[PDB]
Structure 1
Amino acid sequence: KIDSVLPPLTVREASGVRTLSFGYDTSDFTIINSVLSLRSRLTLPTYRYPLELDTANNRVQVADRFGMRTGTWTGQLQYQHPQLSWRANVTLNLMKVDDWLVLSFSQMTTNSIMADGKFVINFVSGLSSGWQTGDTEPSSTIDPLSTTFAAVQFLNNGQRIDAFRIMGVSEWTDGELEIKNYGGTYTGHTQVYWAPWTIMYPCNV
């Protein structure tokens, strides 16, 4: 039947007995259970967010949402001072940009404030869909995480007086974000007009 044999196939006549064998690369293959098997089958790694595998085009990429994720918080902005405290209905815009959380305040009119004080935002409830309270937790306990200025107008018996307020992100406790108002320029007033302002802090959730 079989006259000759071509590689990988070879016939070795050792001890007057002709034996047929299959030749293979030792580092590539191995015989297990009397079959040709691959030595070291390479398993492809998985990817943790913000890295993702686009299975449709077999491409690894940074998730789009990582650069920008929007949301809103609806609740009551709490002003706190031992001698004066109030609640104002606000809706603030939120945006996750990389490892930062940005809060955007639109203009607002509030009751009067003391020379210094605290603003508290309770994220326990009020977040738009897709957002969890934990998503607003800062990635550091350093105080302050960031400071910004808010431009205001103090209303005092008809006259509008331009001033500023310095605001610092200082604490986060069980979903309550605390923004300290260290001070700034001040005058006796009845009401405050706040121009829009943004504040951001590190957040890796």
Structure 2
Amino acid sequence: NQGVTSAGAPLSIRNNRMTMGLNDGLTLSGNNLAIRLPGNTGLNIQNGGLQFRFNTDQFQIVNNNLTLKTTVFDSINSRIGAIEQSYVASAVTPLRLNSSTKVLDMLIDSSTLEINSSGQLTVRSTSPNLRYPIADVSGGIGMSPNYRFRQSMWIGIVSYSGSGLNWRVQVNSDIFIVDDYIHICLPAFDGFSIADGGDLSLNFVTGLLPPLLTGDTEPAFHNDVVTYGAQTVAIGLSSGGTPQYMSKNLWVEQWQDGVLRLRVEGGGSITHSNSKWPAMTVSYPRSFT
């Protein structure tokens, strides 16, 4: 009576002695009841009770809720802003970016453009299209030396004919071709009687020195009839005595089938049986393709 004879859990009595039942998590510390916190799991008895512990840089409490400090992601939100601000996502032709290989390259026309051995871009050097007499003269565009000067020779027959007089003669003659003119340089020669008027004929069908050809003696006026290069020449006329020199008019009259005709006329005449012709050069513009 007035004593204590029974007790409600977690108190219990045995033989006048009271003890207390504890689950895990409650324990004895010195003489006192305490919360038991095995290990280090962020819980601790500190500042007068039970508290939770968290790295101060990574976490914080807001209205007593565990929260993440925003300064956690700063290094990430920066390293990505440092890109979104400027980077290449697409490329326009001639550029092409393979979104998968992360590889960019360029579309060049191989015909016009190429890459240096030094990895540079440069224009394909193309040989220019040239028509004779324009040609590659030692590296550059120039003038074919062959157009400017070509030397040959003619060994052939010169035929005179004028109102019923006829004779031939063999001559040896230099030929020069220079730009658009040809020059036949006839030596002096002897022949027979000439008429007041007549034709002198150079037969190029035979006798030109290779690689020259009969067609190479065709005038630019082809086979028209002309009075081209009209000049005055002097011819010794005689009957075996001292020749008398007669002035005569000579010109290029017409070219036909590789035979060039020169007219020889004017000056009045004289009975004679032999003629002493001088050297005469004959020039005319030459045919081309």
Read off the aligned partner of 2:157 and give its amino acid letter: Q
Report the number of matched residues. Answer: 181
Secondary structure (helix, strand or coil) at the match of 2:195 reads coil
Q: Show the 5 A alignment for 1:35-114.
A: 36-38=108-110, 40=112, 43-54=126-137, 57-114=138-195
Q: Judging changes above 3 Å, is the alpha-carbon distance between structure 1 residues 194 and 39 closer, same or farther for their aligned structure 2 residues?
A: closer
| Residue 78 of structure 1: how far off its partner (Å) | 0.7
The residue number in structure 1 matching 2:37 is none
Paired with 1:110 and 1:142, the residues of 2 have a C-alpha distance of 26
The residue number in structure 2 matching 1:130 is 211
Paired with 1:85 and 1:98, the residues of 2 have a C-alpha distance of 35
Read off the aligned partner of 2:263 and give its amino acid letter: K
Q: Show the 5 A alignment for 1:1-205.
A: 11-12=88-89, 19=99, 20=102, 22=104, 31=107, 36-38=108-110, 40=112, 43-54=126-137, 57-140=138-221, 141=224, 143-205=226-288
Structure number with the bigger relative contact order (C-alpha 8 A, sep ≥ 6) is 1
Q: Judging changes above 3 Å, is the alpha-carbon distance between structure 1 residues 129 and 84 closer, same or farther for their aligned structure 2 residues?
A: same
Give yes or no for contact 1:11–1:21 (8 Å, CA) kept in 2. no
TM-score, normalised by the number of residues in structure 2: 0.57
| Residue 186 of structure 1: how far off its partner (Å) | 2.5
The residue number in structure 2 matching 1:28 is none
Gaps of 5+ in 2: 1-86, 91-97, 114-123
* Identical aligned residues as a percent: 25
Bigger CA radius of gyration: 2
Read off the aligned partner of 1:117 and give its amino acid letter: G
Q: Judging changes above 3 Å, is the alpha-carbon distance between structure 1 residues 60 and 192 closer, same or farther for their aligned structure 2 residues?
A: same
**Higher share of residues assigned strand:** 1
